[PDB]
């Protein structure tokens, strides 16, 4: 069931190559890739959520991603996964994807936005499925013999592997501050803001309405958004809230293993 995703939110992170040979911050980013099965099926973890809408309902034609300070909706038909030649998607839920792929040396993901813009991210990888039996073959035959191997199972029931969710940190946005004649103006736009300026000694505090600081430049000031109402996964790419973490809940990993014959 999808009840475990009720109070969560997506996030942004770092990607080493964004299409042209330069780094960027992207709404879709890669975590570890698991290849423990002997049939050659892969499992992938990303930073967006598939199958759940922005009002906490289930709909299999939609996905939600994190825009600047607010999530939004997008189409599922634009999701693609490719290494060398294109791959084929077998099942999705939440953060996770299943795929079958040819051999290669890279891996790429991408999708299409709600204003018609595309995003990509690329990571290195080495893919070579194992050999079963005493012959090397390229496709499934019509006359043969059966030997054991193992695979992944298409099920979304509760399992014994779990991951945690914590409280999000603050977000520094520079754009809020502006520069006027000999003064600095901070814009709230409906969100709580924390500020600190070094001009004229020190000035610290919180605010909810417009405020003006006298005898100060645009520099020597800092702003951030500091109140949140949702929980988020504790990636090794996002700084900690405090010296000791605050747990709020946990969610499970689908698709366990099993024995089959091939």
């Amino acid at each position: 069931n999808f009840n475990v995703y009720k109070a969560t939110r997506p996030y942004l992170a770092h990607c080493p190559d964004c299409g042209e040979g330069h780094s960027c911050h992207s709404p879709i980013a890669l975590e570890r890739i698991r290849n423990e099965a002997t049939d050659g099926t892969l499992k992938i973890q990303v930073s967006l959520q598939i199958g759940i809408k922005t009002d906490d309902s289930h709909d299999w034609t939609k996905l939600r991603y994190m825009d600047s300070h607010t999530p939004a909706d997008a189409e599922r038909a634009g999701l693609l996964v490719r290494t060398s030649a294109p791959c084929t998607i077998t099942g999705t839920m939440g953060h996770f994807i299943l795929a079958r792929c040819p051999k290669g040396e890279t891996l790429t993901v991408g999708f299409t936005d709600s204003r018609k813009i595309s995003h990509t991210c690329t990571h290195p990888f080495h893919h070579e499925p194992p050999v079963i039996g005493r012959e090397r073959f390229h496709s499934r035959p019509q006359h043969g013999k059966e030997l054991p191997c193992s695979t992944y199972v298409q099920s979304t029931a509760a399992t014994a592997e779990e991951i945690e969710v914590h409280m999000p940190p603050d977000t520094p946005d520079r754009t809020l501050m502006t520069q006027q004649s000999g003064n600095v103006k901070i814009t709230v736009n409906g969100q709580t803001v924390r500020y600190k300026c070094n001009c004229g000694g020190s000035n610290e505090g919180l605010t909810t309405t417009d405020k003006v600081i006298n005898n100060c430049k645009i520099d020597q000031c800092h702003a951030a958004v500091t109140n949140h109402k949702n929980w988020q996964y504790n990636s090794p790419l996002v700084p900690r809230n405090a010296e000791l973490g605050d747990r709020k809940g946990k969610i499970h990993i689908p698709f366990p293993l099993a024995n089959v014959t091939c």
Epitope: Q180, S181, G182, N183, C199, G200, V212, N214, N215
Partner: antibody, heavy 117, light 109 residues
């Protein structure tokens, strides 16, 4: 009562220098900036720049990024305006004004500069 | 070069309400321009009236107020008297530098 006191009139010749003062009284000098404005004879006002009383670093406008130099004296609570290498086109009337938040509340009495050959 | 356009003069009668308008030649006036209004004393002295669009200077009586009307900045004065026959100016701030207006004269009959 806040009062701004400026210097008196003076007559100059080309190639000389002139110093215009602006005395401050009634408020703490280092809490607000000092602004300068120029009014040519027969023309409107023109903005030239301001200086931060807390740090002393001045900013100049595009048209006056030249011979003009600003200065401050914290101990005397007085700001100075200096124009060097005077020419006959430099005759005008000058004022000093304070900035309180976004509003230009107060004004000086003005000083008249006459340059002739 | 941006300039602010103002009317030459306005004539009114005692007890009425006077509204003055100014507008720049490069675009509309918005909340971020921080329009300023000052008044020139007949003795060739200057004092400010309206700063930051809708903030009245301390000590200025209740008959002075300002706001933005459409694409033009406006200053409205109620209870006009012969003492109001002065010069009014409009000032606008765009990017690095200020912009000054041409001024106007008030006549009360």
């Amino acid at each position: 009562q806040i009062q701004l006191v400026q210097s008196g009139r003076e007559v100059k010749n080309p190639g000389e220098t002139v110093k215009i003062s602006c005395k401050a009284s009634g408020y703490t000098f280092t809490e607000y900036p000092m602004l300068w404005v120029k009014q040519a004879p027969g023309k409107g006002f023109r903005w030239m720049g301001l200086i931060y009383t807390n740090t002393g670093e001045p900013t100049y406008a595009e048209e006056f990024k030249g011979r003009f130099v600003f200065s401050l004296e914290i101990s005397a609570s007085t700001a100075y305006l200096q124009i060097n290498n005077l020419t006959n086109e430099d005759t005008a009337t000058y004022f000093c004004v304070r900035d309180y938040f976004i509003s230009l509340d107060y004004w000086g009495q003005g000083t008249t500069l006459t340059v002739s050959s | 070069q941006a300039v602010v356009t103002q009317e030459s003069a306005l004539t009114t009668s005692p007890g009425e309400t006077v509204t003055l308008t100014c507008r720049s030649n490069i675009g509309a006036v918005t909340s971020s321009n921080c329009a300023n209004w000052v008044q020139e004393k007949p003795d060739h002295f200057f004092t400010g009236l309206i700063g930051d669009t809708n903030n009245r200077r301390s000590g200025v009586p209740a008959r002075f107020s300002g706001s933005l009307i459409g694409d033009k900045a406006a200053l409205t004065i109620t209870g006009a008297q012969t003492e109001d026959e002065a010069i009014y100016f409009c000032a606008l701030w765009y990017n690095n530098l200020w912009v000054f207006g041409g001024g106007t004269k008030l006549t009360v009959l």
